[PDB]
Design a protein around this ligand. Sequence first.
Ligand code: HEC
Ligand code: HEC
Ligand code: HEC
Ligand code: HEC
Ligand code: HEC
Ligand code: HEC
Ligand code: HEC
Ligand code: HEC
Ligand code: HEC
Ligand code: HEC
Ligand code: HEC
Ligand code: HEC
Lengths: 497, 497, 497
Amino acid sequence: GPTFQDVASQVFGQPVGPDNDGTLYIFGLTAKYTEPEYVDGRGPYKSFLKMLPSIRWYDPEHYWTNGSQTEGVFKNEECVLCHTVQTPTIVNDWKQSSHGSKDIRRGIGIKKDGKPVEDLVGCADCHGNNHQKLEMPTYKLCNDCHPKETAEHRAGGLGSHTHAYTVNVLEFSWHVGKPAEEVTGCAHCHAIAENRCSGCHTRHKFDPAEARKPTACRVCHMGIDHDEWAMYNTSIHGALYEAESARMDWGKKLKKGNYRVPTCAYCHMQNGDHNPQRFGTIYSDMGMFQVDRGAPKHKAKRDSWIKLCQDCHSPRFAADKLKEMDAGVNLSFTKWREAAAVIVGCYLDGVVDPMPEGSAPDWYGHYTFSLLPGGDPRFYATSNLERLGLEMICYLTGNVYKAYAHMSMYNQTYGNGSAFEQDRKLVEIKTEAAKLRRFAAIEKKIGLEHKSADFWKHGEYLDLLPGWKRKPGDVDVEWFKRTDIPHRANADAGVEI
Amino acid sequence: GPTFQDVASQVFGQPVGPDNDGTLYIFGLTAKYTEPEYVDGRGPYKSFLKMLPSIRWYDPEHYWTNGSQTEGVFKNEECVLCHTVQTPTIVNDWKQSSHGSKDIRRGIGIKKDGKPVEDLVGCADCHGNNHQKLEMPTYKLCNDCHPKETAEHRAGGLGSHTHAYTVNVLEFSWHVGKPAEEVTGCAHCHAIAENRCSGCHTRHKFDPAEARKPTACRVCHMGIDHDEWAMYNTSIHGALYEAESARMDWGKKLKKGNYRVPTCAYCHMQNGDHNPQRFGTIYSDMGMFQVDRGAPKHKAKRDSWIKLCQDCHSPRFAADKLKEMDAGVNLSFTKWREAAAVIVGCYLDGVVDPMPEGSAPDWYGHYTFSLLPGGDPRFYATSNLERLGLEMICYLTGNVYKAYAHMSMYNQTYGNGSAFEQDRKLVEIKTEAAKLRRFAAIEKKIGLEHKSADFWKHGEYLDLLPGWKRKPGDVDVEWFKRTDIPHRANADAGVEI
Amino acid sequence: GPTFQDVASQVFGQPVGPDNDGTLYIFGLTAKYTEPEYVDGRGPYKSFLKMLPSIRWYDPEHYWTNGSQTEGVFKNEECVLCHTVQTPTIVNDWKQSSHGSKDIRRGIGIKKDGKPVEDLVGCADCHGNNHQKLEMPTYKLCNDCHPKETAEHRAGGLGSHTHAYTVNVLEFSWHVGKPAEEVTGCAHCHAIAENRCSGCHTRHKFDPAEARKPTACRVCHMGIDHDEWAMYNTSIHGALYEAESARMDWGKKLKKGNYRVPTCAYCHMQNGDHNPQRFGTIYSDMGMFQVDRGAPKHKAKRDSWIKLCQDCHSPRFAADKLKEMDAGVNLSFTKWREAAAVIVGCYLDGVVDPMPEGSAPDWYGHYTFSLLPGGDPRFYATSNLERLGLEMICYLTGNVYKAYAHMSMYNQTYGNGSAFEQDRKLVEIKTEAAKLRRFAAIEKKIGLEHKSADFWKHGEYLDLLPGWKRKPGDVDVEWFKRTDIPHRANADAGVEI
Ligand code: HEC
Ligand code: HEC
Ligand code: HEC
Ligand code: HEC
Ligand code: HEC
Ligand code: HEC
Ligand code: HEC
Ligand code: HEC
Ligand code: HEC
Ligand code: HEC
Ligand code: HEC
Ligand code: HEC
């Protein structure tokens, strides 16, 4: 029988065809989805997880291969001469880096194999000399000469740069639950943070002054999921950053008295510490878990933050501000608990449309309510009620904490990820619940047997989801048995974590 | 019987407990809300209004107390020596201010008690000499030496910095209607504008050049409620600000011919006037009230704006642009009136779900429709229809004016607070109304007696609202009788305003 | 009978009156809409299209008239002397331009009528000498001395600056379908791009260094419809722009090796090319039409982009990144096709509320479903289902392409115009469809004959729409017969395009 594409083709006079053939498809109506070429993904879901081949740049230890057309074994100087023509800005960057320019070195005392590095560190020193065997490095390379910074970069827990990809890409429901090409940016953002040393001070200048700016963090630390850039930017600190950035001295080390305006790096990479997570009171799943950071048991961490603020403030003022955070966060969770009760209530009364058996299976292969134990909280391939619930906990409640932590008066109250956005979301959730209950009450009284629409279960995108093909024995539980990395509490992990 | 927390505890294996004990509560599910420590709030609702104790910094005349552990009576120079170690950036700021540095003084002619201030103005001069009796100032202090700027700062009407807190926090429905810790940022944002002189030129540098930048305004003048920063930033003026900020001379006084790119301060603090409200045609409740600023009766104000624009433009061009504002605003109100008719229509036909008696009482203690006279227009603890109505008038219609006033082509039409967002909101409002009417028609025909869900009336957050505990005689009407400040037209004011 | 205004007046004690009389109308409730003064619009819908008179500045060839009060015939030098007082910043700009300052000229070889322009190019040279016959120029003037840049500016196709106004304002459904004052910003934004040479390097400095910055593009190239500024800004390129803008040398020509950080102009006005559209693979209606830019037939364009990226990158890296775009775009269209099937499905089953005959006629004067052939896809004056459909294709699906094209990891996945926003919109669309189907099923079973509410068809804004007054013979089809400009595929064009 005719597909959507076939019918569209008959109406628009454009033939049906594969999406990838170069045809300009009118509103994409007659194009058929083709699976891109994949490589196998790593981690506990390696039986079905895929990546686009471009993962080569971001997990090079497992995917990098020679793909160059240029042959030869060259000296550093030859790399530079040719790349001056072939990739000019890479050479320009490198010539403006202390690797490539002795004049801007600070005599730090860099050593490799116990011996001082006094020469230029050239293209070949980082990439190899043989153009058919070029290397694409990770922090492993940098460790040869920068062990302190590397050790710190590798010292974080779950929720830090240290495990951003290895755990929080490869084990994460929203990543493993979707076609690889949909979530490439997830893999790369998280992998840049973990596997590279260029997230903050970019290649090839590797300039710490660049790394001190909020621009060194906000590409990743932004948005509806974790809006700390916006929270910072809409604080008075953030406004003063914008005011003073052009004329302030960014060449000063992150130290007490060196800056008027605090940046992300100033407060989180205190005194140049490359394990920024460690200053946090406790990992709270981005504020989705409730904790009072001002409670007696967290006094050491609270006192440490107060002292940090005291670089530029009264400690009494700082203490008050962090207490405002504690209070504002605790109030915010009353609205989440209201929402959760309304949402689970609907499930328990059987009035959610669709019910879980009416949707595509979740990424575990289960027909399980997303906001119950064992479910997969999500914004896609689920009911409107469940979507709104996820938005309430993740996008709003988590960001109230971020708004308070970063002194954004507006976003604590009115703005994105605020108290008032929680209010509005709560109204939306109650509205959905009310509609669902009124439909169910009417249908019961008149004896109409409602069946949820097939579009909740099947469709061109929904049919691509991995939940359909999950089967017993498809989890690499040995991965989850590893104790050298932490793990996510996934329902099908199959072992103790 | 078990609460939500008790049930959650039994399912997740985490004990129920107080939110404030430091436990990391899984999705905040088993945490119980505790009331933070409060102090009494001021104003006409002082019988129940509360503040967090940190209000000490923002309304210090009424809440400031000694809270220091350091004892002694010190000279200015001693303040500096110790704070160089203890709060270094405050000293650095102060040393870079004309208060603390004679070299950057301009010989303005500052006097205290009729005598010239020729000495440094040190920590002790503003905070006192006794470390157990330190003072936290307001504009009252600055008035000692800067009477002109202070008088202007105090010359505004309702809707200006002058009464931002005293009237528009302490009398405002959305503030008084919510638990104190939810709205701390409201109190402080508005109180910084009223009680301080550091909102634009921050302490401790007090640099007018900083105050001239848009960053001196946008922390407060932003967002869905009043998006003028975004309107400015998405105008060509705003783009040119971003382009020229790094290299332009911000040390020039706000004067005709001193700037290529106009900022908030250039247009609103014309010639350094510290009463920025006065250049406005008329107060319109943030554009929620409709007025044609191009009408004959406003000619003097319109001509004054045209002349301001003529610093850098043809007055004919300026006149045309402000006429575009008038026309665009007048069109925008047709959509609001459509929305209002649809919404009130639903109330009058009794089909809103919930009806007002089905919700928690409003902050007056009334079960009154929010979009009728005497009601409390709001986005929280109300029906979806009422929420959308408030969003239509406040967030969108008001911001259409702001988009036109600031020359944002995109936000006048497509963007945030635009004509097209009004369109979409109007569709949402009609959609809600249609759903409500279809449910009511069905329920009438089949004889189903619909009762609005209990979650509209009760819940962990809704139960905290002050409407529940309002009672006769709980308003300080003497406050509203004051003629030395203006007042909001609150339903329970009890007197003439 | 009483209107909404009359009833409101009786309730609020404010008389009904015209919106334009200067009265401050309480919530705009008692104000009556008045039609602003219009001039006739141009193009194929000239029989009813209107413009505000301020169109004089933007289509001056057809609308400019003398409106000055100053009389006299003056020399350049006299223009400057008086305007130093009367419009100081225009003179300041001009004195800082190479037109008005020989010292900053670069000896480019500018000629007029085959002769070198060695004098200052003064106010009178561009505006005329007679103050009662002043000229308001377009690119036609600039062509006298800058033929190369003008020819390129005029070399684009549909979707470029070249036809932004002449075709894509005057023929565009959303513009012609709305009252003129609602869409003034549309006319001007598009007309600035087409008719002027000041969109990027603003008057009166006309500084190419300014034009190279992202600020030269983002006022227009922003927002929910086409969010490329945000996509760029949330890429690492964009973060590096913010980091380096203050200290980088913007005086360098856009050339390989002159910049570390690429801007809009660097990538789209390659080597100073003033036809930025031409580097695009193919026009795709802002990504609403699906095309795989990595397909064999587009190899030349793909290779050209790869080489552009190779200014600062491996071509293998660049190739991989553009393949990620291809793959991500192709996945994004599966969700659109799902949405479209759900939406059209509802129309074909007759369950959309309102159905098209229940709404105001579209701008063609038809009662036609907006998401069928011959309909007018839109966000206003339509059903919620149709609104959400338009949002899915235009605001989200189109912007997924923009997110990938500009390397925004976050906006490809989580952010504005992303995969996950598509997910959420798809849930919304299915939710609307489900509600519509459940209502229809109930109403059928109980024998309730549903009539869509009158507010879908009539209202103060809806009644202003041009669809009501469309009639046979009201299209200037001769316009559409023109072959010297391209055309939009409008349903009532009446001829071959
Ligand atoms: C000092 C003035 C800060 C600046 C500048 C920025 N942040 Fe921050 N952040 C700060 C505090 C006091 C807290 C709360 C920590 C606590 O335990 O009390 C935070 C929180 C974060 C987090 C969450 C960390 C966690 O939960 O453990 C993140 C990811 C974060 N901040 C990032 C961040 C970024 C990207 C910033 C610049 C845009 C930034 N912060 C500014 C203090 C300060
Ligand atoms: C952001 C989160 C960063 C990541 C990831 C890495 N670095 Fe870094 N680095 C960053 C900042 C903000 C600074 C300046 C800190 C300060 O004290 O002002 C630096 C500095 C360095 C240095 C210079 C150290 C010195 O003695 O001056 C080095 C050698 C360095 N960084 C190396 C490095 C390595 C090897 C990384 C990967 C493991 C790495 N950095 C990641 C910010 C960030
Ligand atoms: C950078 C552009 C990001 C993209 C794209 C994705 N995420 Fe992210 N992630 C980012 C940051 C900065 C943070 C930390 C914020 C904090 O306060 O800690 C997050 C964190 C999440 C986490 C933790 C979720 C939790 O348990 O509470 C996970 C598992 C996660 N990120 C994974 C991930 C994946 C794979 C994405 C798409 C499938 C997603 N993120 C987008 C920023 C980056
Ligand atoms: C008058 C011109 C002042 C001088 C001189 C100094 N300070 Fe100040 N300070 C002043 C005001 C009006 C305020 C209130 C806040 C506001 O912005 O209006 C303050 C605040 C403080 C604080 C508390 C706030 C904080 O950021 O922690 C402290 C601890 C403080 N001031 C200390 C201080 C010191 C040590 C000074 C000398 C170096 C000093 N101030 C100078 C006004 C004035
Ligand atoms: C001159 C070019 C301006 C700049 C720069 C900014 N604004 Fe403005 N604003 C301007 C006009 C002509 C108007 C309309 C006033 C009238 O009566 O016609 C406004 C309006 C405001 C308002 C509302 C004032 C009122 O209703 O009386 C506010 C609060 C405001 N503008 C603030 C503001 C800010 C914060 C700006 C920088 C981000 C800014 N404006 C820029 C003119 C100009
Ligand atoms: C933003 C709304 C401001 C507030 C609130 C206050 N000030 Fe201000 N101040 C502001 C600007 C934009 C400028 C520069 C204006 C100009 O003409 O360019 C200033 C300047 C001052 C000065 C210097 C005056 C002089 O003769 O050079 C002083 C002494 C001053 N401001 C004091 C002051 C006081 C006492 C305030 C509280 C009452 C205050 N300012 C608030 C912006 C803003
Ligand atoms: C700064 C970060 C703000 C916060 C937080 C709150 N508001 Fe605000 N308020 C702010 C500004 C800049 C403006 C003026 C805009 C204009 O065009 O005039 C507003 C104004 C409102 C008003 C007037 C409402 C009206 O009658 O039309 C009130 C009463 C108000 N603000 C009070 C207030 C409170 C107490 C808040 C939370 C409970 C809220 N605001 C957030 C910016 C600041
Ligand atoms: C050609 C190179 C010009 C010279 C020399 C001057 N102006 Fe101009 N001006 C020019 C153009 C093409 C335009 C149209 C708008 C656009 O951006 O393309 C203008 C506009 C004006 C205006 C009206 C717009 C406004 O901002 O008010 C005025 C009042 C104006 N120009 C005056 C003016 C004066 C006094 C000049 C000499 C100092 C002058 N212009 C030089 C092009 C050119
Ligand atoms: C190089 C690194 C770029 C920068 C900097 C910016 N853009 Fe871009 N853009 C770039 C590519 C490779 C593409 C895809 C083109 C293709 O055919 O593969 C685009 C796309 C656009 C478009 C759409 C053009 C089309 O569909 O033909 C627009 C309108 C656009 N970009 C604008 C734009 C702006 C305003 C930018 C700065 C904010 C910008 N781009 C940055 C490459 C690059
Ligand atoms: C943005 C899309 C632009 C529009 C529209 C126009 N110009 Fe432009 N111009 C722009 C840039 C980014 C640059 C610098 C390009 C570079 O190679 O670095 C320029 C430069 C010019 C120049 C100088 C040429 C030279 O030889 O140095 C001229 C004379 C010029 N532009 C004229 C011009 C005219 C006549 C335009 C209307 C037809 C016009 N520009 C539009 C960006 C943009
Ligand atoms: C600048 C502030 C804009 C305003 C306001 C309007 N539009 Fe726009 N338009 C703008 C740009 C930068 C783009 C190009 C983006 C790209 O990737 O090509 C658009 C394009 C649209 C198009 C094409 C629609 C299509 O067929 O795919 C049209 C017809 C259009 N713009 C017209 C137009 C009108 C008249 C507007 C309001 C009625 C609307 N635009 C707002 C930016 C500018
Ligand atoms: C070690 C200090 C390096 C030196 C010296 C040079 N490069 Fe490099 N490069 C390095 C790393 C760790 C990476 C991986 C990406 C990351 O950000 O961590 C790279 C990447 C490249 C690439 C591919 C990426 C791209 O932008 O195209 C190329 C083509 C490349 N490097 C080339 C190159 C050349 C020519 C160099 C000498 C001038 C050079 N690199 C120096 C680390 C180091």
